[PDB]
Design a binder for this molecule. Structure first.
Ligand SMILES: *[C@@H]1O[C@H](CO[C@@H]2O[C@@H](C)[C@@H](O)[C@@H](O)[C@@H]2O)[C@@H](O[C@@H]2O[C@H](CO)[C@@H](O[C@@H]3O[C@H](CO)[C@@H](O)[C@H](O)[C@@H]3O)[C@H](O)[C@H]2NC(C)=O)[C@H](O)[C@H]1NC(C)=O
Ligand SMILES: CC(C)Cn1ncc2cc(Cc3ccc(F)cc3F)c(C(=O)NCCN(C)C)cc21
Ligand SMILES: *[C@@H]1O[C@H](CO)[C@@H](O[C@@H]2O[C@H](CO)[C@@H](O)[C@H](O)[C@H]2NC(C)=O)[C@H](O)[C@H]1NC(C)=O
Ligand SMILES: *[C@@H]1O[C@H](CO[C@@H]2O[C@@H](C)[C@@H](O)[C@@H](O)[C@@H]2O)[C@@H](O)[C@H](O)[C@H]1NC(C)=O
Ligand SMILES: *[C@@H]1O[C@H](CO[C@@H]2O[C@@H](C)[C@@H](O)[C@@H](O)[C@@H]2O)[C@@H](O)[C@H](O)[C@H]1NC(C)=O
Ligand SMILES: *[C@@H]1O[C@H](CO[C@@H]2O[C@@H](C)[C@@H](O)[C@@H](O)[C@@H]2O)[C@@H](O)[C@H](O)[C@H]1NC(C)=O
Ligand SMILES: CC(=O)N[C@H]1[C@H]([C@H](O)[C@H](O)CO)O[C@@](O)(C(=O)O)C[C@@H]1O
Ligand SMILES: *[C@@H]1O[C@H](CO)[C@@H](O)[C@H](O)[C@H]1NC(C)=O
Length: 526
């Protein structure tokens, strides 16, 4: 029941899963609370305790604005925090198999949410199933989001940038010093994350301070080279200063500004974070990762291009309809409550939403590449086009470009294309296979027979969980026993990927090839 960690003893709880027993250590601190003077600074090493910490409830989530676009709707509220918001939020969770493992592979989860929001305590991140069914140890951590986690005055240690990334990294260090006490193999750690979490995992591949803290990496619908993923030192400053004006903290001494923002309450900082950008989109990362010179020593697209990353295996993939969810967060003519058939004029007005500071020619060039119809009278044409535009530009093509460039340095890479729509999905059907809705299959929620998934879904979760755990254990996401389709390596030439669905699991080649040539070779010029 009690584990001795290097900072003190922690007590866990017992959980019944699938006629077995999993041990959960929920809410173990991994750093001093970043309060007061420590607000905006890097996380600080935690002082020993001599009690027994009761890691028996999820700890506080980090301060964050909440999605209030669909109050009472489960499809949006299931992602909102489900513990108290607090600045005291640097805690982590450990799920160990019971009976205690001997030398188990560790899976470390990093949640997404645009670097502004998220919490490990979400129901779709519950690692008890993975512990039970695969005998891996699952770790997740809370890390600071928004300006409290990524406010940047570059060079200044009072607000150096990337604090939330350093939070994550301090958690990975925690696993290194402590997971062996829990039966875990620190030499066998896989990071996996989704969206901003997956872009975080991709940055830990780049950051030299993380290189000895994990073995392998899984990237779900997200990578650092996505257009929302990194903030420039320019914008980071303009946004750090805009926040200072919006709170009356404008000073001539940069360090005095920070001191001033420390005496503001978390809600005052949260309430002004949206306005630091003049034109925002539904994909607006107001305070995100930056090239700080510490966690990130150069611009990441240059490190990628020139082979400057941890050499190891990666499992990368995306969902079929990544971009549809964002259309009801602002695009004209759209609603989760009608079919959202839009017009050519409605489509064009929607590009101005998602590409605000882009030239008229750039927006015309998006329209041109995405409105050459297989049928001009199909009434869903513009509705589906804009979703693909958002999805290809923001997730699918950056994920493919990352895998391409990363594999070019001789490491095994595996790409998937998740194309199964959940049977219990509360969103409308024109939204398809939405951004974020593989996560429950990865965590094995369809395995519980008691929550109204179909049988075909339990099998698909079962296969995904096996492949995921075989990747973590053996760098190879195969399912070797049940005559499963073999998952080939992704190579720069042939570009083979695995489709994930409940019908046929197929080997295909060169995903969204025509669309990504536009986004990756042309559009970065405009
Ligand atoms: C799908 O739904 C959207 C969203 O509208 C909202 O949700 C619907 C399900 C209904 O409950 C609506 O009452 C509700 O507002 C519809 O988009 C909206 O279409 C209306 C059509 O009248 C637009 O209103 C007009 O807009 C112009 C702007 O120039 C004004 O001149 C007019 O006075 C008038 O208000 C409205 O702007 C528009 N809003 C948004 C956010 O898109 C959409 O028509 C609908 N699609 C369907 C039913 O296929
Ligand atoms: C609301 C502000 C605090 C931030 N904000 N503003 C616009 C917007 C749009 C999204 C997109 C989205 C929403 C619901 C969903 F079901 C799937 C989705 F893709 C998200 C988001 O991603 N929410 C959680 C889903 N996982 C993947 C992280 C967040 C957004
Ligand atoms: C491979 O297939 C076997 C069946 O041959 C699967 O075993 C099932 O396991 C679940 C959970 O223990 C049981 O409810 C089922 O009844 C079993 N099937 C049978 C036919 O008895 C196994 O899970 C599969 N592995 C995968 C898909 O990774
Ligand atoms: C920490 O936990 C101690 C034991 O918890 C209690 O006893 C065990 C056997 C379980 O039944 C558990 O659910 C009970 O709550 C407490 O006695 C102790 O006070 C706790 N420390 C705190 C609350 O600071
Ligand atoms: C635990 O195993 C250690 C070796 O780890 C091995 O190599 C890494 C790269 C992983 O892929 C992992 O699966 C392998 O087991 C030993 O050095 C260590 O002594 C072992 N400790 C035990 C058994 O307590
Ligand atoms: C940099 O910031 C400038 C000022 O920001 C805007 O104006 C003031 C009054 C604040 O209310 C702030 O929130 C506003 O958004 C912008 O004018 C300028 O364009 C910015 N440069 C960028 C975004 O590249
Ligand atoms: C945000 C916060 O600090 N929450 C704390 C809660 C609440 O303050 C109370 O339950 C009243 O809401 O109290 C605890 O003792 C508890 O019971 O877990 C500790 C926990 O950290
Ligand atoms: C800004 O203030 C700090 C102490 O808060 C000091 O070290 C620094 O020299 C100051 N810079 C000025 C006044 O230009």
């Amino acid at each position: 029941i009690i584990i001795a960690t290097k900072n003190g003893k922690v007590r866990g709880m017992q959980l019944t899963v699938f006629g077995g027993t999993v041990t959960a250590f929920l809410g173990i601190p991994y750093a001093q609370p970043p309060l007061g003077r420590l607000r905006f600074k890097k996380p600080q090493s935690l002082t020993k305790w001599s009690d027994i910490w009761n890691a028996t409830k999820y700890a506080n989530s980090c301060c964050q604005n909440i999605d209030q676009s669909f109050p009472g709707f489960h499809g949006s509220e299931m992602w909102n925090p489900n513990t108290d918001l607090s600045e005291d939020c640097l805690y982590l969770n450990v799920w160990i198999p019971a009976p205690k493992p001997k030398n188990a592979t560790v899976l470390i989860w990093i949640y997404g949410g645009g670097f502004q929001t998220g919490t490990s305590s979400l129901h779709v991140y519950d690692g008890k199933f993975l512990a039970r069914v695969e005998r891996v140890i699952v770790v997740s951590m809370n890390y600071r989001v928004g300006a409290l986690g990524f406010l940047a005055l570059p060079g200044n240690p009072e607000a150096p940038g990337n604090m939330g990334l350093f939070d994550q990294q301090l958690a990975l260090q925690w696993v290194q010093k402590n997971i062996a006490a829990f039966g875990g193999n620190p030499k066998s750690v896989t990071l996996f994350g989704e969206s901003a979490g997956a872009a975080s995992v991709s940055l830990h591949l780049l950051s030299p301070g993380s290189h000895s803290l994990f073995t392998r990496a899984i990237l779900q619908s997200g990578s650092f080279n996505a257009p929302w993923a990194v903030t420039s030192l320019y914008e980071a400053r303009n946004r750090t200063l805009n926040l200072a004006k919006l709170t009356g903290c404008s000073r001539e001494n940069e360090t005095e500004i920070i001191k001033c923002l420390r005496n503001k309450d978390p809600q005052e900082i949260l309430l002004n974070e949206a306005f630091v950008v003049p034109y925002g989109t539904p994909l607006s990362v107001n305070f995100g990762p930056t090239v700080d010179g510490d966690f990130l020593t150069d611009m990441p697209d240059i490190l990628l291009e020139l082979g400057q990353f941890k050499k190891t295996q990666i499992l990368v993939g995306v969902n079929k309809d990544e971009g549809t969810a964002f259309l009801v967060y602002g695009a004209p003519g759209f609603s989760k409550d009608n079919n959202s058939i839009i017009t050519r004029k409605e489509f064009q007005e929607g590009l101005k939403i998602f590409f605000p500071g882009v030239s008229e020619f750039g927006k015309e060039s998006i329209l041109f590449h995405y409105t050459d119809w297989v049928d001009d009278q199909r009434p869903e044409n513009y509705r589906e086009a804009l979703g693909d535009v958002v999805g290809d530009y923001n997730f699918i093509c950056p994920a493919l470009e990352f895998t391409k460039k990363f594999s070019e340095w001789g490491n095994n890479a595996f790409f998937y294309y998740f194309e199964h729509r959940s049977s219990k999905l509360p969103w409308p059907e024109w939204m398809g296979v939405m951004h974020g809705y593989e996560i429950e299959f990865v965590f094995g929620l369809p395995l519980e027979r008691r929550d109204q998934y179909t049988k075909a879904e339990e099998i698909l979760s079962r296969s995904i969980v096996k492949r995921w755990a075989n990747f973590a254990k053996y760098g190879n996401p195969q399912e070797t026993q049940n005559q499963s389709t073999s998952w080939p390596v992704f190579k720069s030439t042939e570009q083979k990927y695995l489709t994930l669905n409940t019908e046929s699991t197929r080997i295909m080649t060169k995903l969204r090839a025509q669309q990504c040539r536009f986004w990756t070779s042309f559009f970065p010029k405009v």
